[PDB]
Protein backbone atom coordinates (compact mmCIF):
# COMPACT_ATOMS: atom_id res chain seq x y z
CA UNK A 1 0.00 0.00 0.00
CA UNK A 2 3.09 2.22 0.33
CA UNK A 3 6.22 2.63 -1.78
CA UNK A 4 8.37 2.19 1.33
CA UNK A 5 7.05 -1.32 1.90
CA UNK A 6 8.80 -2.55 -1.27
CA UNK A 7 12.13 -2.00 0.52
CA UNK A 8 11.25 -4.82 2.97
CA UNK A 9 10.29 -7.74 0.69
CA UNK A 10 13.59 -9.55 1.39
CA UNK A 11 16.35 -9.73 4.01
CA UNK A 12 17.67 -6.26 4.89
CA UNK A 13 20.96 -5.58 6.73
CA UNK A 14 20.67 -3.61 9.99
CA UNK A 15 23.07 -1.42 11.97
CA UNK A 16 22.35 -0.07 15.46
CA UNK A 17 24.45 2.57 17.24
CA UNK A 18 23.65 3.80 20.75
CA UNK A 19 25.31 6.40 22.92
CA UNK A 20 24.13 6.29 26.52
CA UNK A 21 24.52 8.09 29.84
CA UNK A 22 22.76 6.56 32.88
CA UNK A 23 23.34 8.33 36.21
CA UNK A 24 26.55 9.71 34.67
CA UNK A 25 27.82 6.28 33.54
CA UNK A 26 28.64 6.85 29.86
CA UNK A 27 28.58 3.88 27.49
CA UNK A 28 28.20 2.93 23.82
CA UNK A 29 26.77 -0.09 21.99
CA UNK A 30 27.10 -1.21 18.37
CA UNK A 31 24.79 -3.78 16.83
CA UNK A 32 24.54 -5.51 13.47
CA UNK A 33 22.38 -8.13 11.84
CA UNK A 34 19.42 -8.42 9.53
CA UNK A 35 15.65 -8.24 9.42
CA UNK A 36 13.08 -10.13 7.37
CA UNK A 37 9.72 -8.39 7.60
CA UNK A 38 8.08 -11.25 5.64
CA UNK A 39 8.38 -13.26 8.86
CA UNK A 40 8.50 -10.31 11.27
CA UNK A 41 11.96 -11.53 12.25
CA UNK A 42 15.08 -9.72 13.51
CA UNK A 43 18.46 -11.33 14.20
CA UNK A 44 21.00 -9.01 15.83
CA UNK A 45 24.17 -9.04 17.91
CA UNK A 46 25.13 -6.11 20.13
CA UNK A 47 28.54 -5.33 21.70
CA UNK A 48 29.28 -2.82 24.45
CA UNK A 49 32.28 -1.00 23.02
CA UNK A 50 33.08 0.83 26.27
CA UNK A 51 33.64 -2.15 28.58
CA UNK A 52 30.92 -3.67 30.73
CA UNK A 53 27.42 -2.39 30.11
CA UNK A 54 26.39 -0.39 33.23
CA UNK A 55 22.73 -1.42 32.92
CA UNK A 56 21.28 -4.86 32.18
CA UNK A 57 21.09 -5.85 28.51
CA UNK A 58 17.34 -6.56 28.62
CA UNK A 59 16.56 -2.98 29.62
CA UNK A 60 17.87 -1.77 26.21
CA UNK A 61 16.02 -4.25 23.92
CA UNK A 62 13.13 -1.91 23.09
CA UNK A 63 15.52 0.97 22.40
CA UNK A 64 17.65 -1.14 20.04
CA UNK A 65 13.18 -1.00 14.26
CA UNK A 66 9.43 -1.63 14.09
CA UNK A 67 9.54 -1.34 10.29
CA UNK A 68 10.47 -5.05 10.49
CA UNK A 69 7.12 -6.03 12.00
CA UNK A 70 5.01 -8.33 9.83
CA UNK A 71 1.89 -6.49 8.73
CA UNK A 72 -0.63 -8.97 7.24
CA UNK A 73 -1.82 -8.18 3.74
CA UNK A 74 -5.18 -6.84 4.91
CA UNK A 75 -3.38 -4.35 7.21
CA UNK A 76 -0.77 -2.96 4.79
CA UNK A 77 -2.49 0.44 4.77
CA UNK A 78 -1.81 0.72 8.53
CA UNK A 79 1.98 0.26 8.44
CA UNK A 80 3.33 3.70 9.32
CA UNK A 81 6.87 2.42 9.89
CA UNK A 82 7.56 1.19 6.35
CA UNK A 83 5.65 4.05 4.71
CA UNK A 84 8.15 6.56 6.13
CA UNK A 85 11.08 4.82 4.38
CA UNK A 86 13.63 5.36 3.03
CA UNK A 87 13.82 8.86 4.54
CA UNK A 88 12.85 7.34 7.87
CA UNK A 89 11.38 8.44 11.17
CA UNK A 90 12.33 9.89 14.53
CA UNK A 91 11.42 7.65 17.47
CA UNK A 92 11.29 9.27 20.91
CA UNK A 93 10.54 7.55 24.20
CA UNK A 94 10.33 7.95 27.91
CA UNK A 95 10.67 4.64 29.79
CA UNK A 96 9.67 4.74 33.46
CA UNK A 97 11.08 1.92 35.56
CA UNK A 98 8.68 1.41 38.45
CA UNK A 99 10.19 2.43 41.81
CA UNK A 100 13.37 3.44 39.93
CA UNK A 101 14.69 5.90 37.34
CA UNK A 102 13.80 6.57 33.72
CA UNK A 103 15.35 6.50 30.27
CA UNK A 104 14.70 9.21 27.69
CA UNK A 105 15.68 8.23 24.16
CA UNK A 106 15.78 9.87 20.75
CA UNK A 107 16.54 7.78 17.67
CA UNK A 108 16.55 8.14 13.91
CA UNK A 109 15.63 5.05 11.89
CA UNK A 110 16.35 5.34 8.17
CA UNK A 111 18.10 3.75 5.24
CA UNK A 112 21.75 4.58 4.70
CA UNK A 113 22.33 2.96 1.34
CA UNK A 114 20.95 -0.58 1.46
CA UNK A 115 21.16 -0.80 5.27
CA UNK A 116 18.47 0.08 7.80
CA UNK A 117 20.23 2.09 10.53
CA UNK A 118 18.90 2.92 14.03
CA UNK A 119 21.02 5.64 15.71
CA UNK A 120 20.07 6.39 19.34
CA UNK A 121 20.96 8.81 22.12
CA UNK A 122 19.84 7.63 25.58
CA UNK A 123 19.84 9.54 28.88
CA UNK A 124 18.96 7.82 32.16
CA UNK A 125 18.43 9.61 35.47
CA UNK A 126 17.33 9.01 39.05
CA UNK A 127 18.32 5.33 39.22
CA UNK A 128 18.90 3.70 42.60
CA UNK A 129 22.48 2.52 43.04
CA UNK A 130 21.30 -0.89 44.28
CA UNK A 131 18.00 -1.01 42.40
CA UNK A 132 17.31 -3.69 39.86
CA UNK A 133 18.96 -1.76 37.00
CA UNK A 134 22.24 -0.45 38.43
CA UNK A 135 22.41 -3.46 40.74
CA UNK A 136 22.10 -5.88 37.79
CA UNK A 137 19.26 -7.94 39.30
CA UNK A 138 17.40 -8.65 36.07
CA UNK A 139 17.38 -12.13 34.53
CA UNK A 140 18.85 -12.54 31.05
CA UNK A 141 15.57 -13.31 29.30
CA UNK A 142 12.63 -11.51 27.76
CA UNK A 143 8.86 -11.75 27.77
CA UNK A 144 6.15 -11.37 25.13
CA UNK A 145 4.20 -8.10 25.04
CA UNK A 146 1.37 -6.22 23.37
CA UNK A 147 2.34 -2.88 21.79
CA UNK A 148 -0.51 -0.40 21.24
CA UNK A 149 -0.44 1.97 18.24
CA UNK A 150 -2.60 5.02 17.52
CA UNK A 151 -2.35 7.77 14.91
CA UNK A 152 -1.29 11.29 15.95
CA UNK A 153 -2.73 13.31 13.07
CA UNK A 154 -1.45 16.67 14.32
CA UNK A 155 2.17 15.43 14.20
CA UNK A 156 1.69 13.40 11.00
CA UNK A 157 2.86 10.40 13.01
CA UNK A 158 1.95 7.82 15.63
CA UNK A 159 1.84 7.44 19.40
CA UNK A 160 2.74 4.09 20.95
CA UNK A 161 2.24 2.77 24.49
CA UNK A 162 3.03 -0.47 26.27
CA UNK A 163 4.48 -1.96 29.45
CA UNK A 164 7.59 -4.16 29.44
CA UNK A 165 7.93 -6.81 32.16
CA UNK A 166 11.52 -7.68 33.13
CA UNK A 167 11.93 -10.78 35.28
CA UNK A 168 13.98 -10.17 38.45
CA UNK A 169 16.34 -12.85 39.81
CA UNK A 170 14.23 -13.21 42.99
CA UNK A 171 11.01 -14.11 41.15
CA UNK A 172 9.55 -10.58 41.04
CA UNK A 173 9.02 -8.43 37.92
CA UNK A 174 10.40 -4.98 37.12
CA UNK A 175 7.87 -2.94 35.15
CA UNK A 176 9.04 -0.50 32.46
CA UNK A 177 6.26 1.78 31.23
CA UNK A 178 6.92 2.94 27.65
CA UNK A 179 5.62 6.20 26.15
CA UNK A 180 6.60 6.57 22.52
CA UNK A 181 6.14 8.97 19.59
CA UNK A 182 7.25 8.53 15.96
CA UNK A 183 7.35 11.27 13.34
CA UNK A 184 8.51 11.06 9.70
CA UNK A 185 11.81 12.62 8.71
CA UNK A 186 10.73 13.18 5.10
CA UNK A 187 8.01 15.32 3.53
CA UNK A 188 6.33 12.62 1.43
CA UNK A 189 3.01 11.15 2.54
CA UNK A 190 2.90 8.44 5.18
CA UNK A 191 0.24 5.97 6.26
CA UNK A 192 -1.55 6.95 9.46
CA UNK A 193 -3.11 3.84 11.02
CA UNK A 194 -6.29 2.99 12.79
CA UNK A 195 -5.77 1.83 16.36
CA UNK A 196 -4.13 -1.61 16.48
CA UNK A 197 -1.47 -3.64 18.26
CA UNK A 198 1.73 -5.56 17.69
CA UNK A 199 2.45 -8.90 19.39
CA UNK A 200 6.12 -9.41 20.27
CA UNK A 201 8.44 -12.12 21.47
CA UNK A 202 12.19 -12.11 21.95
CA UNK A 203 14.91 -14.63 22.79
CA UNK A 204 18.26 -13.58 24.27
CA UNK A 205 21.45 -15.61 23.98
CA UNK A 206 25.24 -15.47 24.01
CA UNK A 207 27.84 -15.96 21.29
CA UNK A 208 30.29 -18.61 22.57
CA UNK A 209 33.10 -16.99 20.56
CA UNK A 210 32.66 -13.58 22.16
CA UNK A 211 34.54 -12.44 25.27
CA UNK A 212 33.27 -8.85 25.16
CA UNK A 213 30.04 -7.85 26.91
CA UNK A 214 27.33 -8.56 24.36
CA UNK A 215 23.79 -9.73 23.57
CA UNK A 216 22.40 -11.94 20.77
CA UNK A 217 18.73 -11.22 20.03
CA UNK A 218 16.14 -13.12 17.98
CA UNK A 219 12.82 -11.31 17.82
CA UNK A 220 9.46 -11.85 16.05
CA UNK A 221 6.75 -9.18 15.80
CA UNK A 222 3.37 -9.40 14.04
CA UNK A 223 0.76 -6.65 13.70
CA UNK A 224 -2.90 -7.44 14.33
CA UNK A 225 -6.18 -6.00 15.54
CA UNK A 226 -7.75 -4.79 12.28
CA UNK A 227 -10.26 -6.95 10.41
CA UNK A 228 -11.36 -6.71 6.76
Amino acid sequence: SSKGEELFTGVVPILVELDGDVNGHKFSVSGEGEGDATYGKLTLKFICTTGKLPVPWPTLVTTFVQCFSRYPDHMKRHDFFKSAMPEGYVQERTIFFKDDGNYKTRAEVKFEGDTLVNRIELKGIDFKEDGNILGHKLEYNYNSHNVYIMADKQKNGIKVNFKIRHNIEDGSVQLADHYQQNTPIGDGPVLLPDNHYLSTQSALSKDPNEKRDHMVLLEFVTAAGITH
Binding site: M150, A224, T227
Partner: protein
Protein backbone atom coordinates in the same frame (compact mmCIF):
# COMPACT_ATOMS: atom_id res chain seq x y z
CA UNK B 1 -9.81 -21.72 20.17
CA UNK B 2 -7.32 -18.90 20.68
CA UNK B 3 -6.34 -19.10 17.00
CA UNK B 4 -10.04 -19.50 16.07
CA UNK B 5 -10.67 -15.80 16.92
CA UNK B 6 -7.75 -13.89 15.31
CA UNK B 7 -8.14 -14.61 12.26
CA UNK B 8 -11.66 -15.53 13.24
CA UNK B 9 -13.52 -18.83 12.85
CA UNK B 10 -17.00 -18.16 14.23
CA UNK B 11 -18.31 -21.55 13.10
CA UNK B 12 -15.24 -23.12 14.73
CA UNK B 13 -16.13 -21.38 18.01
CA UNK B 14 -19.34 -23.40 18.21
CA UNK B 15 -17.50 -26.48 16.91
CA UNK B 16 -14.59 -26.23 19.37
CA UNK B 17 -17.01 -25.87 22.30
CA UNK B 18 -12.83 -26.74 25.18
CA UNK B 19 -11.72 -24.11 27.70
CA UNK B 20 -13.66 -20.97 26.80
CA UNK B 21 -11.09 -18.99 28.83
CA UNK B 22 -7.86 -20.57 27.59
CA UNK B 23 -4.96 -18.16 28.17
CA UNK B 24 -1.80 -17.25 26.29
CA UNK B 25 1.46 -15.59 27.36
CA UNK B 26 -0.20 -12.17 27.61
CA UNK B 27 -3.31 -13.44 29.40
CA UNK B 28 -5.56 -13.10 26.36
CA UNK B 29 -8.63 -15.29 26.17
CA UNK B 30 -10.43 -15.85 22.87
CA UNK B 31 -12.71 -12.96 23.83
CA UNK B 32 -9.76 -10.57 24.05
CA UNK B 33 -8.66 -11.57 20.55
CA UNK B 34 -12.19 -11.29 19.14
CA UNK B 35 -12.79 -7.85 20.71
CA UNK B 36 -10.78 -6.30 17.81
CA UNK B 37 -13.76 -6.24 15.46
CA UNK B 38 -15.04 -9.86 15.24
CA UNK B 39 -18.60 -9.20 16.40
CA UNK B 40 -20.01 -12.64 15.56
CA UNK B 41 -17.18 -14.43 17.36
CA UNK B 42 -17.58 -12.23 20.46
CA UNK B 43 -21.25 -13.24 20.54
CA UNK B 44 -20.51 -16.97 20.19
CA UNK B 45 -17.94 -16.85 22.98
CA UNK B 46 -20.23 -14.95 25.35
CA UNK B 47 -23.12 -17.34 24.69
CA UNK B 48 -20.83 -20.26 25.58
CA UNK B 49 -19.94 -18.73 28.95
CA UNK B 50 -16.73 -16.82 28.24
CA UNK B 51 -15.55 -14.82 31.26
CA UNK B 52 -16.66 -11.38 30.09
CA UNK B 53 -14.44 -9.65 32.69
CA UNK B 54 -11.21 -11.64 32.19
CA UNK B 55 -8.22 -9.32 32.67
CA UNK B 56 -5.01 -9.63 30.64
CA UNK B 57 -1.45 -9.19 31.88
CA UNK B 58 -1.89 -5.37 31.88
CA UNK B 59 -5.35 -5.46 33.48
CA UNK B 60 -7.33 -5.00 30.25
CA UNK B 61 -10.73 -6.61 30.00
CA UNK B 62 -12.28 -7.23 26.57
CA UNK B 63 -14.31 -4.03 27.08
CA UNK B 64 -11.08 -2.07 27.48
CA UNK B 65 -9.76 -3.46 24.20
CA UNK B 66 -13.04 -2.75 22.41
CA UNK B 67 -12.95 0.81 23.74
CA UNK B 68 -9.40 1.29 22.43
CA UNK B 69 -10.10 -0.23 19.02
CA UNK B 70 -13.33 1.74 18.65
CA UNK B 71 -15.89 -1.04 18.01
CA UNK B 72 -19.25 0.29 19.21
CA UNK B 73 -21.25 -2.90 18.62
CA UNK B 74 -18.72 -5.03 20.50
CA UNK B 75 -18.82 -2.59 23.42
CA UNK B 76 -22.61 -2.98 23.38
CA UNK B 77 -22.68 -6.78 23.38
CA UNK B 78 -20.02 -7.05 26.10
CA UNK B 79 -22.18 -4.79 28.27
CA UNK B 80 -25.29 -6.79 27.39
CA UNK B 81 -23.50 -9.91 28.70
CA UNK B 82 -22.55 -8.25 31.95
CA UNK B 83 -19.18 -6.64 31.33
CA UNK B 84 -18.05 -4.51 34.28
CA UNK B 85 -18.50 -1.02 32.88
CA UNK B 86 -16.10 0.39 35.51
CA UNK B 87 -13.33 -2.23 35.46
CA UNK B 88 -9.96 -0.56 36.04
CA UNK B 89 -6.68 -1.60 34.44
CA UNK B 90 -3.30 -1.38 36.19
CA UNK B 91 -3.13 2.37 35.48
CA UNK B 92 -6.57 2.89 37.00
CA UNK B 93 -8.19 3.47 33.60
CA UNK B 94 -11.79 2.45 33.14
CA UNK B 95 -13.20 1.93 29.65
CA UNK B 96 -14.60 5.45 29.89
CA UNK B 97 -11.08 6.81 30.51
CA UNK B 98 -9.90 4.96 27.39
CA UNK B 99 -12.78 6.20 25.25
CA UNK B 100 -12.05 9.74 26.44
CA UNK B 101 -8.29 9.43 25.71
CA UNK B 102 -8.83 8.00 22.23
CA UNK B 103 -11.71 10.27 21.16
CA UNK B 104 -14.54 7.72 20.79
CA UNK B 105 -17.66 9.81 21.45
CA UNK B 106 -20.33 7.23 20.57
CA UNK B 107 -18.64 4.77 22.93
CA UNK B 108 -18.49 7.42 25.69
CA UNK B 109 -22.27 7.73 25.38
CA UNK B 110 -22.97 3.99 25.52
CA UNK B 111 -20.70 3.66 28.55
CA UNK B 112 -22.50 6.53 30.35
CA UNK B 113 -25.90 4.98 29.52
CA UNK B 114 -24.68 1.70 31.08
CA UNK B 115 -23.61 3.25 34.39
CA UNK B 116 -20.02 4.30 33.80
CA UNK B 117 -18.70 6.34 36.73
CA UNK B 118 -18.00 9.77 35.32
CA UNK B 119 -15.99 10.66 38.47
CA UNK B 120 -13.73 7.58 38.49
CA UNK B 121 -10.09 8.44 39.13
CA UNK B 122 -7.02 6.72 37.71
CA UNK B 123 -3.91 6.03 39.81
CA UNK B 124 -2.99 9.74 39.49
CA UNK B 125 -6.39 11.13 40.44
CA UNK B 126 -7.53 11.95 36.90
CA UNK B 127 -11.10 11.52 35.67
CA UNK B 128 -12.16 10.72 32.11
CA UNK B 129 -12.91 14.40 31.55
CA UNK B 130 -9.41 15.35 32.69
CA UNK B 131 -8.00 12.98 30.06
CA UNK B 132 -10.39 14.19 27.35
CA UNK B 133 -9.06 17.71 27.97
CA UNK B 134 -5.44 16.52 27.94
CA UNK B 135 -6.03 14.86 24.56
CA UNK B 136 -7.93 17.78 23.01
CA UNK B 137 -11.30 15.98 22.85
CA UNK B 138 -13.48 18.96 23.65
CA UNK B 139 -16.84 17.45 22.65
CA UNK B 140 -16.26 14.49 24.99
CA UNK B 141 -15.10 16.80 27.76
CA UNK B 142 -18.36 18.73 27.44
CA UNK B 143 -20.50 15.58 27.49
CA UNK B 144 -18.65 14.34 30.57
CA UNK B 145 -19.06 17.69 32.31
CA UNK B 146 -22.82 17.71 31.81
CA UNK B 147 -23.05 14.12 33.02
CA UNK B 148 -21.15 14.93 36.21
CA UNK B 149 -23.49 17.85 36.86
CA UNK B 150 -26.56 15.66 36.44
CA UNK B 151 -25.02 13.21 38.95
CA UNK B 152 -24.84 16.13 41.41
CA UNK B 153 -28.38 17.39 40.64
CA UNK B 154 -29.73 13.91 41.34
CA UNK B 155 -27.60 13.62 44.48
CA UNK B 156 -29.00 16.95 45.71
CA UNK B 157 -32.54 15.72 45.21
CA UNK B 158 -31.67 12.54 47.12
CA UNK B 159 -30.10 14.44 50.03
CA UNK B 160 -32.97 16.93 50.19
CA UNK B 161 -35.71 14.36 49.70
CA UNK B 162 -37.29 16.74 47.19
CA UNK B 163 -37.44 17.42 43.50
CA UNK B 164 -34.74 19.65 41.98
CA UNK B 165 -35.15 21.37 38.62
CA UNK B 166 -32.18 22.60 36.63
CA UNK B 167 -31.30 24.19 33.33
CA UNK B 168 -28.11 25.58 31.80
CA UNK B 169 -28.65 27.71 28.66
CA UNK B 170 -26.15 29.35 26.30
CA UNK B 171 -26.68 33.09 26.72
CA UNK B 172 -25.79 34.01 23.13
CA UNK B 173 -27.48 31.21 21.16
CA UNK B 174 -30.22 30.05 23.54
CA UNK B 175 -29.15 26.41 23.20
CA UNK B 176 -30.11 24.17 26.11
CA UNK B 177 -26.83 22.74 27.35
CA UNK B 178 -28.27 20.48 30.08
CA UNK B 179 -31.47 20.22 32.06
CA UNK B 180 -33.43 18.21 34.61
CA UNK B 181 -37.17 18.42 35.36
CA UNK B 182 -37.05 21.50 33.16
CA UNK B 183 -40.74 21.48 32.19
CA UNK B 184 -42.08 20.99 35.73
CA UNK B 185 -43.59 23.87 37.69
CA UNK B 186 -41.80 25.25 40.76
CA UNK B 187 -42.61 28.26 42.94
CA UNK B 188 -40.62 31.28 41.71
CA UNK B 189 -40.39 32.93 45.13
CA UNK B 190 -38.44 36.20 44.91
CA UNK B 191 -36.85 35.15 41.60
CA UNK B 192 -39.96 36.74 40.04
CA UNK B 193 -38.45 40.16 40.86
CA UNK B 194 -36.13 39.95 37.82
CA UNK B 195 -39.23 39.68 35.61
CA UNK B 196 -40.88 42.56 37.47
CA UNK B 197 -37.81 44.73 36.88
CA UNK B 198 -37.90 43.79 33.20
CA UNK B 199 -41.51 44.93 32.99
CA UNK B 200 -40.65 48.22 34.70
CA UNK B 201 -37.74 48.79 32.31
CA UNK B 202 -40.00 48.04 29.33
CA UNK B 203 -42.42 50.72 30.56
CA UNK B 204 -39.53 53.19 30.96
CA UNK B 205 -38.40 52.45 27.39
CA UNK B 206 -41.95 53.10 26.11
CA UNK B 207 -42.31 56.39 28.00
CA UNK B 208 -44.94 54.89 30.34
CA UNK B 209 -42.71 55.24 33.42
CA UNK B 210 -39.86 57.40 34.68
CA UNK B 211 -36.85 56.19 36.70
CA UNK B 212 -37.03 59.40 38.72
CA UNK B 213 -40.74 59.31 39.60
CA UNK B 214 -41.16 59.45 43.38
CA UNK B 215 -43.61 57.10 45.07
CA UNK B 216 -44.88 57.86 48.57
CA UNK B 217 -46.19 55.03 50.72
CA UNK B 218 -47.29 54.47 54.29
CA UNK B 219 -46.77 52.14 57.22
CA UNK B 220 -49.72 50.07 56.00
CA UNK B 221 -47.84 49.23 52.81
CA UNK B 222 -44.89 47.77 54.70
CA UNK B 223 -44.75 43.98 54.73
CA UNK B 224 -42.16 41.73 56.27
CA UNK B 225 -38.61 41.86 54.95
CA UNK B 226 -38.51 45.41 53.59
CA UNK B 227 -35.04 46.56 54.66
CA UNK B 228 -34.77 49.54 52.33
CA UNK B 229 -38.39 50.71 52.15
CA UNK B 230 -38.86 50.68 55.93
CA UNK B 231 -36.11 53.36 56.14
CA UNK B 232 -37.73 55.74 53.61
CA UNK B 233 -41.27 56.03 54.94
CA UNK B 234 -41.04 59.80 55.35
CA UNK B 235 -39.52 60.78 52.00
CA UNK B 236 -40.63 57.97 49.71
CA UNK B 237 -38.50 56.38 47.01
CA UNK B 238 -38.08 56.76 43.29
CA UNK B 239 -38.87 53.99 40.80
CA UNK B 240 -35.14 53.49 40.28
CA UNK B 241 -34.52 53.12 44.02
CA UNK B 242 -37.44 50.72 44.38
CA UNK B 243 -36.26 48.51 41.52
CA UNK B 244 -32.74 48.51 42.95
CA UNK B 245 -34.10 47.54 46.36
CA UNK B 246 -36.37 44.83 44.97
CA UNK B 247 -33.57 43.16 42.96
CA UNK B 248 -30.52 43.63 45.13
CA UNK B 249 -32.05 43.36 48.63
CA UNK B 250 -35.18 41.39 47.72
CA UNK B 251 -37.22 44.18 49.37
CA UNK B 252 -40.80 42.92 49.50
CA UNK B 253 -42.60 46.27 49.88
CA UNK B 254 -40.54 47.63 47.01
CA UNK B 255 -41.67 44.76 44.79
CA UNK B 256 -45.33 45.25 45.81
CA UNK B 257 -45.17 49.01 45.08
CA UNK B 258 -43.67 48.28 41.63
CA UNK B 259 -46.33 45.62 40.98
CA UNK B 260 -49.04 48.19 41.60
CA UNK B 261 -47.55 50.38 38.88
CA UNK B 262 -48.07 47.63 36.27
CA UNK B 263 -51.50 46.39 37.35
CA UNK B 264 -50.44 43.87 39.96
CA UNK B 265 -49.63 40.20 39.48
CA UNK B 266 -52.16 40.06 36.62
CA UNK B 267 -50.28 42.89 34.91
CA UNK B 268 -46.95 41.10 35.25
CA UNK B 269 -48.52 37.95 33.84
CA UNK B 270 -49.87 39.96 30.88
CA UNK B 271 -46.38 41.35 30.22
CA UNK B 272 -45.01 37.81 30.20
CA UNK B 273 -47.74 36.46 27.93
CA UNK B 274 -47.20 39.32 25.48
CA UNK B 275 -43.47 38.53 25.11
CA UNK B 276 -44.32 34.86 24.47
CA UNK B 277 -43.98 33.23 27.91
CA UNK B 278 -47.34 31.46 28.28
CA UNK B 279 -46.13 29.40 31.27
CA UNK B 280 -44.79 31.73 33.97
CA UNK B 281 -47.49 33.35 36.07
CA UNK B 282 -47.71 35.64 39.07
CA UNK B 283 -50.98 35.62 41.06
CA UNK B 284 -50.22 36.89 44.56
CA UNK B 285 -48.22 39.65 46.24
CA UNK B 286 -45.34 39.48 48.70
CA UNK B 287 -45.18 37.52 50.96
CA UNK B 288 -48.12 35.22 50.15
CA UNK B 289 -46.55 34.22 46.81
CA UNK B 290 -43.97 32.09 48.70
CA UNK B 291 -46.48 29.62 50.18
CA UNK B 292 -45.40 26.79 47.82
CA UNK B 293 -48.59 24.75 48.32
CA UNK B 294 -48.33 21.33 46.61
CA UNK B 295 -50.22 21.21 43.29
CA UNK B 296 -50.77 25.00 43.35
CA UNK B 297 -50.06 26.52 39.95
CA UNK B 298 -50.05 30.08 41.30
CA UNK B 299 -46.79 32.02 41.28
CA UNK B 300 -44.89 29.31 39.39
CA UNK B 301 -42.52 29.01 36.47
CA UNK B 302 -40.62 26.12 34.91
CA UNK B 303 -36.82 26.07 34.66
CA UNK B 304 -36.96 26.36 30.86
CA UNK B 305 -39.57 29.12 30.84
CA UNK B 306 -37.70 31.24 33.37
CA UNK B 307 -34.33 30.71 31.70
CA UNK B 308 -35.73 31.52 28.23
CA UNK B 309 -37.55 34.62 29.45
CA UNK B 310 -34.52 35.87 31.38
CA UNK B 311 -32.37 35.38 28.27
CA UNK B 312 -34.83 37.42 26.19
CA UNK B 313 -34.77 40.24 28.77
CA UNK B 314 -30.97 40.33 29.07
CA UNK B 315 -29.93 39.81 25.43
CA UNK B 316 -33.04 40.07 23.27
CA UNK B 317 -34.81 43.01 21.69
CA UNK B 318 -37.46 43.28 24.43
CA UNK B 319 -35.51 46.03 26.21
CA UNK B 320 -33.34 48.80 24.80
CA UNK B 321 -29.59 48.23 25.09
CA UNK B 322 -29.43 50.66 28.02
CA UNK B 323 -32.26 48.91 29.83
CA UNK B 324 -30.92 45.40 29.33
CA UNK B 325 -27.57 46.63 30.71
CA UNK B 326 -29.41 48.17 33.68
CA UNK B 327 -31.13 44.86 34.47
CA UNK B 328 -27.80 43.05 34.34
CA UNK B 329 -26.12 45.72 36.49
CA UNK B 330 -28.79 45.45 39.18
CA UNK B 331 -28.56 41.64 39.24
CA UNK B 332 -24.75 41.86 39.38
CA UNK B 333 -25.14 43.92 42.59
CA UNK B 334 -27.38 41.33 44.32
CA UNK B 335 -26.58 41.46 48.06
CA UNK B 336 -28.63 38.54 49.44
CA UNK B 337 -27.52 35.47 47.44
CA UNK B 338 -24.12 34.98 49.10
CA UNK B 339 -24.52 31.35 50.22
CA UNK B 340 -25.62 30.05 46.80
CA UNK B 341 -23.69 30.21 43.50
CA UNK B 342 -21.58 33.15 44.73
CA UNK B 343 -20.16 30.93 47.51
CA UNK B 344 -18.37 28.72 44.94
CA UNK B 345 -17.69 31.27 42.20
CA UNK B 346 -13.97 31.50 41.35
CA UNK B 347 -11.90 34.64 41.13
CA UNK B 348 -12.48 36.76 38.06
CA UNK B 349 -15.85 35.27 37.19
CA UNK B 350 -18.93 37.38 36.56
CA UNK B 351 -22.34 36.68 38.09
CA UNK B 352 -25.65 38.49 37.92
CA UNK B 353 -28.27 36.66 39.95
CA UNK B 354 -31.48 36.64 41.99
CA UNK B 355 -32.38 34.10 44.68
CA UNK B 356 -35.57 33.05 46.40
CA UNK B 357 -36.71 31.17 49.48
CA UNK B 358 -40.19 30.15 50.52
CA UNK B 359 -42.23 27.78 52.62
CA UNK B 360 -42.05 23.98 52.46
CA UNK B 361 -38.34 23.95 51.69
CA UNK B 362 -38.58 26.07 48.57
CA UNK B 363 -35.33 27.57 47.33
CA UNK B 364 -34.05 28.76 44.01
CA UNK B 365 -31.75 30.95 41.96
CA UNK B 366 -31.56 32.46 38.48
CA UNK B 367 -28.19 33.64 37.18
CA UNK B 368 -26.19 34.84 34.20
CA UNK B 369 -22.56 33.94 34.81
CA UNK B 370 -19.25 33.20 33.17
CA UNK B 371 -15.48 33.31 33.49
CA UNK B 372 -13.20 36.25 32.69
CA UNK B 373 -15.63 38.95 33.75
CA UNK B 374 -18.39 38.29 31.21
CA UNK B 375 -21.61 36.27 31.45
CA UNK B 376 -22.04 33.54 28.86
CA UNK B 377 -24.66 31.13 30.28
CA UNK B 378 -27.92 31.25 32.21
CA UNK B 379 -28.45 28.82 35.09
CA UNK B 380 -31.79 28.24 36.83
CA UNK B 381 -32.11 25.96 39.87
CA UNK B 382 -35.32 25.35 41.83
CA UNK B 383 -36.34 22.98 44.61
CA UNK B 384 -39.47 22.62 46.74
CA UNK B 385 -40.82 20.09 49.24
CA UNK B 386 -37.72 19.38 51.34
CA UNK B 387 -37.78 19.24 55.12
CA UNK B 388 -34.09 20.20 55.20
CA UNK B 389 -32.73 23.30 56.89
CA UNK B 390 -31.88 26.51 55.07
CA UNK B 391 -28.15 25.78 55.41
CA UNK B 392 -28.68 22.34 53.82
CA UNK B 393 -30.68 23.80 50.93
CA UNK B 394 -28.01 26.45 50.37
CA UNK B 395 -25.21 23.88 50.38
CA UNK B 396 -26.94 21.63 47.84
CA UNK B 397 -27.50 24.56 45.43
CA UNK B 398 -23.90 25.69 45.93
CA UNK B 399 -22.63 22.16 45.17
CA UNK B 400 -24.64 22.04 41.93
CA UNK B 401 -23.00 25.35 41.09
CA UNK B 402 -19.54 24.02 41.88
CA UNK B 403 -20.15 21.10 39.54
CA UNK B 404 -21.31 23.21 36.60
CA UNK B 405 -18.37 25.56 37.14
CA UNK B 406 -15.90 22.66 37.30
CA UNK B 407 -17.32 21.20 34.10
CA UNK B 408 -17.66 24.49 32.27
Amino acid sequence: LLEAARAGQDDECRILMADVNALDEVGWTPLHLAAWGHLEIVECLLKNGADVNAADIDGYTPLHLAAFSGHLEIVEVLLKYGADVNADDQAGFTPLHLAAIFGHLEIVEVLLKNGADVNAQDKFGKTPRDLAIDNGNEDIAEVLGKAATLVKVKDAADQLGARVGYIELDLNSGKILESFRSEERFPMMSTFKVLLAGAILSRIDAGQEQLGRRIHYSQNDLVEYSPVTEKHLTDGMTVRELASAAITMSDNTAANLLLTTIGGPKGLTAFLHNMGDHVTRLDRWEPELNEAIPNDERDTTTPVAMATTLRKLLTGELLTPASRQQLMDWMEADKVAGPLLRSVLPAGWFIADKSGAGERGSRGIVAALGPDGKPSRIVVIYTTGSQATMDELNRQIAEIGASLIKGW
